[PDB]
Design a protein around this nucleic acid. Structure first.
Ligand SMILES: [Mg+2]
Lengths: 57, 300, 113, 113, 207, 49
DNA sequence: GGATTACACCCAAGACACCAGGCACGAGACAGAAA
RNA sequence: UGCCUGGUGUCUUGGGUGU
DNA sequence: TTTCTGTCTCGTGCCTGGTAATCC
């Protein structure tokens, strides 16, 4: 989530974060709910866009 | 200083936002906060920011060295000589400044790295410094018989697994509770397992992956308080068997390690997790040793 | 209106290609349509459809008609077109094919009508 | 053609084994699934190949070698064409002839038509 | 070695919810999920299974007199601000008032002392990015009419110069797509531009 | 399971006469045994057999 | 000798690797034997 | 708060429907 | 007859191979 890259053995990883749709929820700047796979565009900065892969915090 | 990449990428949520516009930060105070300087260096290496070291009294040193070097003549020839000397001195300063800046930067980097190394060493030592749980009416260092109960998640369809290990460190019996943990049947079966089979565990450990485990912990504590399940003491206020939460980084890593699979080829993953919890309670140091390489991935 | 009320729709297809089934959606009223999406609406009046009877001996055995939705369970034809189809109403059956694109709809309405 | 159709390629020295998509298995009932005809024919061909390899290295009566190699030739030939006039067809355990690859492509129900 | 270490309330909370006490405390905004709507309160669930509740004073704005059920329904997640945290019982109270969910922007406690912080640079960058936000795009208008011509004011006047008195040309107006400038030749080398305001427009290019 | 409804079946898995049925409804309930998986790990008897 | 003989559609009903024989693991019963 | 499922043999044969 | 037990019979299990025109 920080933006860095790491290399670790498969054993060292804790576990997959299995999250239900009731847990993986995203809200945009305006407050409209955005779900998995939707396309959003960055409001500022590079103003890039893409499809959501996973939502965390 | 900030590059265009720094001008665009340093967001209010990014960890680099703490020094987006820092200025005139004292060097002597940096050693007390090594992580700030390390993060500044990391941001610099990303092509976002530029770290600059400057002296408020640089002009004072330049003027003093010029006064030492300059001639005292007043003729126009002496004026030309002094001008040539001063210009060469300024060029020498221009050449010299970057090397001194780099040397000072490397010195501060080494100091901060050593400070953070010592800090991490102390944190790890604090993490791994804990003797095994001492049951009452026993001397310190005695290995207690332990019982671990866990169900993992608590979704509809989550049975509670129980694993008991003696002081010898060898698994004695594993049991499944297939009824609901809130039913009277669950409590009765757990009481029968605790009492009838002469298991007599010295401490009971409870752990899980979410907040659902809290209800199990409360239910177990209520059961212990209700049935007066006092510890058996080898031959009189008999003491109750303690029920606590257990830290489970080593257990989580052990449930995925192939060492457990070789040790227990016909056991479920939750059984391996409970065994890891029990071994951690028996001896945290040996469990931390069992991590081998994965210990370096722990949040220290 | 949903997939059970005429006029209605069966699916909503997003730009990425995902299909939203309106039978199993609990929040059909909470769907907003964006430009470029596709709605698999029901067959409506004046939709060109290809109509066919076997054996197809000549090219007048496949002709494009305009849809008119009617009760009861039989296809209905003006009786003048029973000659090219070689059809009568003693039990014959005929095939209907629905175009699925603007290009194909234009071809049917401009060539096979 | 030197590049594309060289005459010695008309003799099979290595056989390509098609993926299971070409020879899918069917679940006859809720428990037992049925291997396809091509799968059984390939199993027979591979058994004959193993038999030839085993016989060659151990001991070589020419009569036995001729018999086994002729069996392998028969299996490979019937795997691709089971209507060779002048010799009996390969039969399944149920008595029906094997559906060779050539039979898949011809007729009204073949691939092309 | 020291005796066995017993986890406390903060450690148990961090172990169970995998959320630190710093990242989950007063004055934080989280996208909680509505689980039950009632007239006097709303029961919501956070991402980390932490059950929350809001008393009726905060689901709806103090000025509004609507009903909680009409505005918010089950499955409609909304932003909420943490007011209190029961770490032992994993219970929290939230507020939907915009004074928390919106005004809380600079939630970091970074010391902005001018001696060690360049406030002027951050402010200047802030108006730079705000002006960038103000920046937009515009395009030309296309209208189909026999007497409509996409010409400038001087271009329209020159086009009407070769024409006798009274001929009329129509061009887009500078006051917006909802306005139309009509240029007609009053006299030789004399032209009048008249602005026409459009109402009930079907489209920008439409009439 | 089939997408139809099983609520019209009796205790013995057979529908009773006099019951109105529609398309895709289940009129005969039959199950075949399957070797259980490793779900006995932590499933409270709620594992598909 | 080889190849091919109209188009489309509906429904129902009967068959689809079986087996036998030689090799292994575990168990148990009824008879041995000391006392 | 207890919470919802789309996945359907094959090969033969026989009797039929419309030309 | 009481008691410890042997050791080979035998239940349960399984591997794996035998076995109708016409026409060119
Ligand atoms: Mg007829």
């Amino acid at each position: 989530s920080d933006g860095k890259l790491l290399s670790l053995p498969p054993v060292s990883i804790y576990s997959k974060l299995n999250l239900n749709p009731n847990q993986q929820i995203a809200i945009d700047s305006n407050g409209v709910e955005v779900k998995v796979g939707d396309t959003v565009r960055e409001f500022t900065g590079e103003r890039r866009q893409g499809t959501i892969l996973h939502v965390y915090r | 200083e900030l590059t265009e990449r720094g001008k665009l990428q340093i967001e209010p949520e990014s960890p680099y936002f703490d020094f987006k516009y820092a200025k005139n930060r004292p060097i002597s105070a940096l050693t007390a906060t090594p992580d700030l300087y390390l993060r500044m260096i990391q941001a610099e290496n990303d092509g976002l920011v530029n770290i600059k070291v400057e002296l408020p009294m640089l002009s004072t040193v330049v003027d003093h060295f010029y006064n030492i070097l300059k001639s005292d003549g007043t003729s126009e020839i002496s004026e030309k000589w002094n001008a040539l000397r001063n210009d060469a001195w300024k060029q020498s300063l221009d050449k010299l400044i970057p090397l001194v800046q780099l040397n000072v930067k490397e010195s501060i980097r080494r100091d901060c790295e050593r400070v953070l190394y010592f800090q991490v060493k102390n944190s790890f030592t604090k993490k791994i410094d804990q003797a095994p749980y001492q049951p009452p009416t026993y001397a310190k260092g005695t290995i207690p018989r332990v019982l671990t109960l866990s169900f993992g998640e608590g979704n509809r369809g989550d049975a509670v697994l129980g694993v008991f290990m003696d002081d010898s460190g060898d698994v004695k019996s594993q049991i499944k509770f297939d009824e609901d943990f809130q039913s009277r049947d669950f409590s009765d079966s757990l009481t029968r397992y605790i009492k009838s089979n002469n298991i007599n565990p010295d401490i009971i450990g409870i752990s899980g992956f979410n907040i659902h485990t809290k209800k199990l912990f409360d239910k177990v504590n209520e059961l212990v308080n209700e049935e007066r399940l006092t510890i058996e003491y080898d031959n009189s206020d008999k003491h109750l068997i303690r029920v606590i939460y257990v830290n489970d980084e080593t257990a989580r890593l052990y449930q995925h390690s192939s060492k457990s699979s070789a040790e227990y080829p016909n056991r479920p993953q939750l059984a391996k997790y409970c065994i890891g919890l029990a071994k951690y309670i028996q001896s945290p140091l040996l469990e931390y040793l069992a991590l081998d390489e994965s210990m370096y991935s722990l949040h220290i | 209106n949903g997939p059970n009320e005429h006029p209605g729709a069966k699916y909503v297809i997003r730009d990425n290609g995902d299909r939203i089934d309106l039978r199993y959606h609990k929040r059909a009223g909470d769907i907003v349509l964006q430009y470029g999406w596709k709605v698999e609406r029901h067959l409506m009046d004046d939709d060109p459809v290809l109509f066919n009877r076997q054996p197809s001996l000549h090219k007048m055995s496949m002709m494009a008609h305009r849809v008119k939705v009617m009760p009861y369970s039989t296809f209905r034809l003006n009786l003048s077109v029973t000659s090219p189809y070689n059809a009568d109403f003693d039990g014959d059956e005929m095939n209907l094919h629905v175009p699925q694109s603007e290009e194909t709809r234009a071809e049917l309405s401009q060539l096979c009508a | 053609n030197e590049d594309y159709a060289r005459p010695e390629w008309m003799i099979i020295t290595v056989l390509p084994v098609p993926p299971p998509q070409v020879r899918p298995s069917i679940a006859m009932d809720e428990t037992t699934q049925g291997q396809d005809d091509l799968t059984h024919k390939l199993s027979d061909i591979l058994k004959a190949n193993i038999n030839v390899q085993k016989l060659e290295m151990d001991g070589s009566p020419q009569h036995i070698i001729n018999e086994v190699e002729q069996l392998l030739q028969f299996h490979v030939a019937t795997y691709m064409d089971n209507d060779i006039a002048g010799q009996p067809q390969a039969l399944q355990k149920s008595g029906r002839p094997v559906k060779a690859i050539r039979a898949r492509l011809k007729g009204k129900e073949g691939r092309l038509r | 070695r020291r005796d066995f270490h017993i986890l406390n309330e903060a450690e148990i909370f961090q172990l169970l919810t995998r959320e630190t006490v710093d990242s989950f405390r007063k004055g934080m905004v989280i996208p909680v999920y509505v689980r039950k709507v009632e007239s006097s309160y709303m029961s919501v669930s956070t991402q980390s299974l932490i059950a929350g509740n809001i008393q009726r004073q905060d689901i709806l704005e103090p000025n509004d007199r609507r009903d909680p059920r009409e505005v918010y329904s089950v499955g409609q997640t909304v932003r909420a601000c943490i007011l209190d945290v029961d770490y032992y019982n994993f219970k929290c109270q939230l507020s939907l008032l915009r004074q928390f969910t919106e005004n809380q922007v600079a939630g970091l406690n970074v010391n902005r002392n001018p001696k060690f912080w360049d406030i002027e640079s951050e402010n200047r960058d802030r108006q730079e990015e705000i002006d960038k936000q103000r920046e937009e795009s515009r395009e030309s208008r296309v209208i189909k009419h026999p007497f409509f011509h996409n010409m400038k004011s001087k271009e329209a006047e020159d086009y009407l110069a070769a024409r006798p008195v009274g001929d009329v040309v129509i061009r887009p107006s500078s006051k917006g797509s909802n306005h139309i400038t009509i240029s007609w030749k009053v006299a030789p080398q004399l032209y009048q531009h008249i602005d026409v305001l459009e109402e009930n427009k079907d489209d920008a290019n439409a009439i | 399971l089939k997408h139809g409804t099983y609520e019209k079946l009796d205790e013995d898995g057979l529908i009773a006469p006099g019951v109105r049925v529609s398309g895709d409804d289940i009129i005969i309930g039959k199950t075949t045994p399957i070797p259980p998986d490793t779900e006995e790990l932590g499933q409270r008897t709620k594992y598909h057999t």
